[PDB]
């Protein structure tokens, strides 16, 4: 079931938001995106809209 759970690492390598996970799997590790944007990782940003702080 979708957990937090992610490496030392994914401490940033997703530039917008992003909600670490792993996925139930041997491995996957990443942050899902957000409301507003997506792609690899919505670096496909549609500007400032949602979240500021």
């Known amino acids: 079931n979708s957990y937090p759970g992610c490496p030392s690492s994914y401490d940033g390598y997703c530039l ?3 909600v670490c996970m792993h996925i139930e799997s041997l491995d ?3 942050c899902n995106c957000v409301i ?3 792609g690899d990782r919505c670096q496909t940003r549609d500007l ?3 979240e500021l702080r």
Do not use: D, I, K, V
């Open 16 to 18: 917008n938001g992003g």
């Open 28 to 30: 996957s590790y990443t």
């Open 36 to 38: 507003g944007y997506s």
């Open 48 to 50: 400032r809209w949602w």
